[PDB]
Amino acid sequence: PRPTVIITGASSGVGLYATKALANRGWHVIMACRNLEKAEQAAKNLQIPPEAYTILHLDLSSLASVRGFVESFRALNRPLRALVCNAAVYYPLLKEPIYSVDGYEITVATNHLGHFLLINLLLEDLKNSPESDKRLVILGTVTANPPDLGNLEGFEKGFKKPIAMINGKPFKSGKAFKDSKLCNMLTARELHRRFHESTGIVFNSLYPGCVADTYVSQELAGERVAMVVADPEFRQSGVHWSWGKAFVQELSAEASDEQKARRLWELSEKLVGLA
């Protein structure tokens, strides 16, 4: 009897050490990955036993792929205990936006909108599971409090070319990334508010520390993801765990983001075909 956790972006970095850590605690990790070849090599290289994992293809930049990943998880007939939204892309060199298969600026489309659809479909799976300690963890920003969503003008007007930023202003890829990470935080917050009572699922977020990409190792950061998913200390919905022993804060900490967080959620449903 082995409890199931899905990890997005599990074939490298933090996601890969997180899957290692959770397997060592005796979990069965669904490595939901873009690149099946790299996922297979990585799994074997870290010496993880075949019972501890299953690789399923997931491309967060395609909503058809998010839907299809979900049907494939369901076919396993494994009760879901947890979900980790860890996958993040970042294209620092782009001067011009790239638009996903579904027509959305790719950074926001992958980091936010694809995780948004994934979360919303898997809530059904999460709420129907008979596991008692069910968590949904999102990798977010340093603190729950540069990114600026404005009045969401870009999302209000449908978020298609020529719109490449959530606030409807000219494309900036580094800001797009930060915007996207803000969306992840706002979404965690809003999952707690909308669903924690009705389901009893723990909805939290974390920041495992600054990590070597383009003061903390991938191994440790991955251990810290595992802690947030699995250990009794971290079993509390509505909060952000940060390593800068963790500082904890309420996801709803910043009161003036309340309206934004709600409007973000409603616009996101529209963008991914839930409304």
Ligand X SMILES: NC(=O)c1ccc[n+]([C@@H]2O[C@H](COP(=O)([O-])OP(=O)(O)OC[C@H]3O[C@@H](n4cnc5c(N)ncnc54)[C@H](OP(=O)(O)O)[C@@H]3O)[C@@H](O)[C@H]2O)c1
Pick the stretch among 11-19, 69-77, 189-197, 224-232 that binds ligand X (CB under 6 A): 11-19
- Measured at the CA of 179, the angle between CA 177 and CA 185, to 5 degrees, comes to 110
Task: Tell me: does residue 65 bind Cl ion (CB under 5 A).
Answer: yes
Among 5, 6, 13, 125, binds ligand X (CB under 6 A): 13
Among 68, 147, 150, 168, binds Cl ion (CB under 5 A): 68
- The whole-angstrom separation of Cα 54 and Cα 31 is 6
How many residues form the binding site for ligand X (CB under 6 A)? 26
Which residues precede chain breaks (C–N over 2.5 Å) in the chain? 145, 214, 244
CB of 261 to Zn ion, least distance (A): 9
Residue with smaller CB distance to ligand X, 14 or 165: 14
Name the residue among 219, 247, 234, 258 with its Cα closest to residue 14.
Answer: 219
CB of 213 to ligand X, least distance (A): 5
Q: What is the DSSP code string of 204-265?
A: EEEE---B----B-HHHHHHHHHHHHH-GGG--TTEEEE----EEEETT--GGGHHHHHHHH
Among 6, 139, 246, 272, binds ligand X (CB under 6 A): 139
Please identify the residue of the shown chain whose CB is closest to the bound Cl ion: 57
Q: Which does 253 bind (CB under 5 to 8 A by kind): Zn ion, ligand X, Cl ion, none?
A: none
CB of 231 to Zn ion, least distance (A): 17
Q: Which does 112 bind (CB under 5 to 8 A by kind): ligand X, Zn ion, Cl ion, none?
A: Zn ion
Number of residues written out for the chain: 275
Spatial strand order in the sheet of 247-250: 53-57, 28-33, 4-8, 80-85, 135-139, 202-207, 239-242, 247-250
Per-residue interface string for the shown chain with ligand X, residues 230-259, x marking contact by CB under 6 A: ------------------------------
Given a contact cutoff of 8 angstroms between Cβ atoms, the answer to whether 80 and 125 are in contact is yes
Q: Which of residues 110-129 bind Zn ion (CB under 5 A)?
A: 112, 115-116
Among 211, 216, 220, 253, binds ligand X (CB under 6 A): 211
Per-residue interface string for the shown chain with Zn ion, residues 32-61, x marking contact by CB under 5 A: -------------------------x----
Task: Tell me: does residue 180 bind ligand X (CB under 6 A).
Answer: no
Given a contact cutoff of 8 angstroms between Cβ atoms, the answer to whether 27 and 52 are in contact is yes
Among 46, 76, 210, 248, binds ligand X (CB under 6 A): 210
Residue with smaller CB distance to ligand X, 14 or 108: 14
Q: Would you tell me which residues interact with Cl ion (CB under 5 A)?
A: 57, 65, 68, 273
Q: Would you tell me which residues interact with ligand X (CB under 6 A)?
A: 8-9, 11-15, 33-35, 38-39, 58-61, 86-89, 110, 139, 181, 210-211, 213
